[PDB]
């Protein structure tokens, strides 16, 4: 019972909805994690084979069922709706630590509007003695002023997460804040997310712009690209490479989510050409592959500066950011407004993306009962209650020690297995049972225009085994996982992720059960 009211504002929402804080962090942190530059080789193969045939195939599905993305596979076919209900429980997981980083992000905002840079000197009440500057490291018990600062004042490291800590007030009230930021706007203003960004959307990418000159200019940056580009065929057959790169390939694009079915599903029949799929895939993965630039090339000079070999410099987790950042920002001149500059687009970033996710989780779940539901002041319960149980669940990562069950949040839930499961179902589904001719002769009509065969031969024969395969080598080829190559984590913890992991993974067979029973 409702329809976007210009046709900008559905190209603006899919285009906020998928750049943002995995593009710009989560991407060269995983293009970091191994070694070389072996992540591009899937990385191209998986999105030209899955990313956007999906991301087209989840618009047009919504566009033809006008309906929520939890049912518009049902109107598809009565069964493998699992898929859809994984999707909403990855999202909701998802928003639980997704929302945390933000958290951290807004307290280096509020930290950096002090004179002097906390994170620029050595002596705090939060230093070792083992405290060094970079300037004259190069002048192996030794660490550097910004590694101390991240691991000991954002949030304290505990020795381990078998050994919880105290509650933290500081990142808690971050986070509060960030959460009463979103609920206003989320209760006032719903068209906002599209209607007033018109002149703020070209903001991050001017930043982004300034941000890849500045570290261009930066030195040390042949190093970085040489090891962001070349990639490394020595280390290919384990299964960890092909992993993270699929993964990160659905992650950016925001596939199995949810909410590209339902930004699609908005508008009515007989929509505009769908070339604008094509158009924003290619931009978004441009902006992804013109951010690692940047990110690389500070790396490499933080490389050179340091002394140490690259792989090594920063943590190797999801902290490659807040110690890159910073020491690009530091030598830059007059760092306390391109602090605070850089920070507020970070901000708008991780905004943008969290209420279109929230948008869509809460349409999701108003389609799934109307019955109990309706436009109006009745939205306050159902919003109130989430944004509550969402505050509370994550105030579990913001606590000493809560880094290492954030990490645990970033292998497993919603990414991984859960993804590559979800997908292959929906291109299986797709594929052998509705059929490719029939969304071709359906879309034949709206388009005018008949696409060549690309859609057929890319959503039977080319994903699945992109899928199976990966999972299988997974399942053969088993690794431990580790927090920066030296912690070990308890059994039970690894229990706890294969736990959170298979949550959204039996959601397809349990519901198949279901409807075969009944
Ligand atoms: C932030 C946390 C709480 C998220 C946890 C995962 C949720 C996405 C799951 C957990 C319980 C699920 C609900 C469990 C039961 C139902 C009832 C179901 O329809 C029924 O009423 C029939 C079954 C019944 O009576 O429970 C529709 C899906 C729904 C709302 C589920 C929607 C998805 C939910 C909220
Ligand atoms: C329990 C642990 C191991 C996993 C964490 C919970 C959720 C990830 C899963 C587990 C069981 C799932 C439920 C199993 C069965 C159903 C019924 C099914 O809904 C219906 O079809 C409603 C009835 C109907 O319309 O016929 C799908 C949603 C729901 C509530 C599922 C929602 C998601 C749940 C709660
Ligand atoms: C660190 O050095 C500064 C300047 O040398 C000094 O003022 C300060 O007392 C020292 N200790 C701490 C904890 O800052
Ligand atoms: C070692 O000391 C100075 C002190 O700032 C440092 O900047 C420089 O790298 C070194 N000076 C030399 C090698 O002359
Ligand atoms: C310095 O590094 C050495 C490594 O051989 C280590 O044994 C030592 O504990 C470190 N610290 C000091 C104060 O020597
Ligand atoms: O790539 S992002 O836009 O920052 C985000 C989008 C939603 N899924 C996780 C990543
Ligand atoms: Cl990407
Ligand atoms: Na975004």
Same mark, same amino acid.
Request: net charge neutral; hydrophobic share 45%.
């Given at each position: 019972?409702?329809?976007?009211?210009?046709?900008?504002?559905?190209?603006?929402?899919?285009?906020?909805?998928?750049?943002?804080?995995?593009?710009?962090?989560?991407? &060269?942190?995983?293009?970091?994690?191994?070694?070389?530059?072996?992540?591009?080789?899937?990385?191209?193969?998986?999105?030209?084979?899955?990313?956007?045939?999906?991301?087209?195939?989840?618009?047009?599905?919504?566009?033809?069922?006008?309906?929520?993305?939890?049912?518009?596979?049902?109107?598809?076919?009565?069964?493998?709706?699992?898929?859809?209900?994984?999707?909403?429980?990855?999202?909701?997981?998802?928003?639980?630590?997704?929302?945390?980083?933000?958290?951290?992000?807004?307290?280096?905002?509020?930290?950096?509007?002090?004179?002097?840079? &906390?994170?620029?000197?050595?002596?705090?009440?939060?230093?070792?003695?083992?405290?060094?500057?970079?300037?004259?490291?190069?002048?192996?018990?030794? %660490?550097?002023?910004?590694?101390?600062?991240?691991?000991?004042?954002?949030?304290?490291?505990?020795?381990?997460?078998?050994?919880?800590?105290?509650?933290?007030?500081?990142?808690?009230?971050?986070?509060?804040?960030?959460?009463?930021?979103?609920?206003?706007?989320?209760?006032?203003?719903?068209?906002?997310?599209?209607?007033?960004?018109?002149?703020?959307? %070209?903001?991050?990418?001017?930043?982004?712009?300034?941000?890849?000159?500045?570290?261009? %200019?930066?030195?040390?940056?042949?190093?970085?690209?040489?090891?962001?580009?070349?990639?490394?065929?020595?280390?290919?057959?384990?299964?960890?490479?092909?992993?993270?790169?699929?993964?990160?390939?659905?992650?950016?694009?925001?596939?199995?989510?949810?909410?590209?079915?339902?930004?699609?599903?908005?508008?009515?029949?007989?929509?505009?050409?769908?070339?604008?799929?094509?158009?924003?895939?290619?931009?978004?993965?441009? %902006?992804?592959?013109?951010?690692?630039?940047?990110?690389?090339?500070?790396?490499?000079?933080?490389?050179?500066?340091?002394?140490?070999?690259?792989?090594?410099?920063?943590?190797?987790? &999801?902290?490659?950011?807040?110690?890159?950042?910073?020491?690009?920002?530091?030598?830059? &001149?007059?760092?306390?407004?391109?602090?605070?500059?850089?920070?507020?687009?970070?901000?708008?970033?991780?905004?943008?993306?969290?209420?279109?996710?929230?948008?869509?989780?809460?349409?999701?779940?108003?389609?799934?009962?109307?019955?109990?539901?309706?436009?109006?002041?009745?939205?306050?319960?159902?919003?109130?209650?989430?944004?509550?149980?969402?505050?509370?669940?994550?105030?579990?990562?913001?606590?000493?020690?809560?880094?290492?069950?954030?990490?645990?949040?970033?292998?497993?839930?919603?990414?991984?297995?859960?993804?590559?499961?979800?997908?292959?179902?929906?291109?299986?589904?797709?594929?052998?049972?509705?059929?490719?001719?029939?969304?071709?002769?359906?879309?034949?009509?709206?388009?005018?225009?008949?696409?060549?065969?690309?859609?057929?031969?890319?959503?039977?024969?080319?994903?699945?085994?992109?899928?199976?395969?990966?999972?299988?080598?997974?399942?053969?080829?088993?690794?431990?996982?580790?927090?920066?190559?030296?912690?070990?984590?308890?059994?039970?913890?690894?229990?706890?992720?294969?736990?959170?992991?298979?949550?959204?993974?039996?959601?397809?067979?349990?519901?198949?059960?279901?409807?075969?029973?009944?």
């Amino acid at each position: 019972r409702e329809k976007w009211s210009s046709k900008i504002d559905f190209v603006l929402s899919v285009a906020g909805g998928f750049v943002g804080l995995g593009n710009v962090w989560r991407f &060269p942190y995983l293009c970091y994690k191994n070694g070389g530059g072996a992540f591009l080789i899937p990385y191209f193969i998986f999105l030209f084979g899955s990313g956007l045939p999906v991301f087209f195939l989840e618009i047009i599905i919504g566009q033809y069922t006008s309906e929520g993305g939890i049912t518009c596979w049902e109107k598809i076919c009565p069964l493998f709706s699992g898929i859809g209900y994984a999707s909403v429980v990855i999202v909701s997981l998802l928003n639980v630590y997704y929302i945390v980083i933000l958290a951290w992000a807004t307290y280096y905002l509020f930290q950096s509007f002090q004179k002097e840079l &906390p994170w620029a000197h050595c002596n705090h009440s939060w230093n070792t003695p083992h405290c060094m500057e970079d300037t004259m490291r190069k002048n192996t018990n030794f %660490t550097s002023p910004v590694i101390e600062f991240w691991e000991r004042n954002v949030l304290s490291l505990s020795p381990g997460i078998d050994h919880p800590g105290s509650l933290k007030w500081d990142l808690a009230l971050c986070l509060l804040l960030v959460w009463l930021v979103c609920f206003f706007c989320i209760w006032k203003g719903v068209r906002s997310t599209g209607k007033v960004v018109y002149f703020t959307a %070209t903001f991050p990418f001017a930043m982004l712009l300034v941000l890849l000159v500045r570290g261009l %200019t930066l030195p040390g940056a042949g190093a970085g690209i040489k090891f962001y580009l070349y990639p490394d065929i020595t280390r290919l057959e384990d299964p960890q490479v092909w992993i993270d790169a699929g993964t990160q390939i659905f992650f950016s694009y925001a596939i199995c989510l949810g909410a590209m079915t339902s930004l699609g599903s908005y508008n009515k029949y007989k929509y505009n050409s769908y070339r604008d799929c094509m158009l924003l895939g290619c931009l978004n993965s441009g %902006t992804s592959f013109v951010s690692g630039f940047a990110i690389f090339s500070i790396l490499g000079f933080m490389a050179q500066e340091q002394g140490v070999d690259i792989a090594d410099v920063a943590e190797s987790g &999801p902290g490659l950011a807040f110690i890159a950042y910073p020491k690009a920002v530091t030598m830059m &001149p007059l760092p306390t407004f391109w602090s605070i500059l850089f920070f507020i687009m970070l901000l708008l970033l991780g905004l943008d993306s969290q209420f279109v996710e929230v948008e869509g989780q809460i349409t999701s779940l108003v389609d799934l009962y109307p019955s109990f539901l309706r436009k109006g002041y009745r939205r306050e319960i159902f919003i109130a209650f989430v944004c509550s149980i969402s505050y509370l669940l994550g105030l579990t990562m913001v606590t000493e020690g809560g880094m290492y069950v954030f990490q645990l949040f970033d292998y497993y839930a919603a990414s991984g297995v859960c993804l590559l499961w979800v997908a292959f179902f929906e291109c299986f589904v797709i594929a052998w049972i509705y059929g490719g001719d029939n969304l071709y002769d359906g879309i034949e009509d709206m388009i005018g225009y008949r696409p060549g065969p690309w859609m057929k031969y890319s959503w039977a024969v080319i994903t699945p085994v992109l899928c199976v395969g990966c999972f299988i080598f997974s399942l053969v080829k088993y690794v431990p996982l580790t927090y920066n190559k030296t912690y070990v984590y308890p059994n039970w913890a690894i229990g706890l992720g294969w736990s959170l992991a298979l949550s959204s993974m039996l959601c397809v067979p349990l519901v198949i059960v279901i409807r075969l029973c009944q």
